[PDB]
Design a protein around this ligand. Sequence first.
Ligand SMILES: Nc1ncnc2c1ncn2[C@@H]1O[C@H](COP(=O)(O)OP(=O)(O)O)[C@@H](O)[C@H]1O
Ligand SMILES: Nc1ncnc2c1ncn2[C@@H]1O[C@H](COP(=O)(O)O)[C@@H](O)[C@H]1O
Length: 214
Amino acid sequence: MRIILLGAPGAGKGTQAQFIMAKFGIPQISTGDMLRAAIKAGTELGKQAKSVIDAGQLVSDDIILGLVKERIAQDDCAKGFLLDGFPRTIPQADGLKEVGVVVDYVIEFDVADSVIVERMAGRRAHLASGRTYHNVYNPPKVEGKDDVTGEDLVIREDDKEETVLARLGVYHNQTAPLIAYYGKEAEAGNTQYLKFDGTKAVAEVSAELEKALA
Ligand SMILES: Nc1ncnc2c1ncn2[C@@H]1O[C@H](COP(=O)(O)OP(=O)(O)O)[C@@H](O)[C@H]1O
Ligand SMILES: Nc1ncnc2c1ncn2[C@@H]1O[C@H](COP(=O)(O)O)[C@@H](O)[C@H]1O
């Protein structure tokens, strides 16, 4: 089972990825989490990516495609995977198509900018796993701490008000065309395309996903 999640930053992709991961027993491949891992390790890649991420801009397609290539070649990805925040640009999608990576579902979570701007304010994240929470819409069971590991949650630097506006502009320019791109792939019979109203409550979005998959 191979799945791509599309939608604005903050649309709820990582949240629904958790549900999907547990339903299909596939690993999540999140380029954002891989980059944050490199930052934590203090690599040259990490140092360079940190300023790009903090500016709300996209990391180079070439660096991204190589991280993803290495990742999906691992054994845990042999029976499938969920791509989360990848692809992010048309060249990334082409890079994936060119190496013949075929996917089963492309799932779009459609959420307006005004809703995203609202949401980012209460996002809290567990950096090591990429699990995210919302202090209003989806809180941790224990405030300030990850439900799984007990480790501290953080406010993301790129979740700042002004950076969020930057990211939404980057999204509408560079990443939204993936909706067309995969709509076309689905029209060619290369994948199934699903679109959901991502402004519904978390449990409501998950319930619709459950009904639509299988
Ligand atoms: N359906 C939803 N309604 C309200 N808030 C949500 C919903 N889905 C996720 N959230 C919250 O909104 C923020 C963004 O969700 P997240 O899954 O991290 O977005 P993405 O992975 O698309 O960037 C998080 O704080 C998350 O807890
Ligand atoms: N596929 C990608 N292509 C380019 N940059 C990315 C990609 N995934 C993550 N990033 C960078 O990491 C940041 C956080 O991504 P995310 O965790 O997916 O919201 C983005 O705003 C980009 O700066």
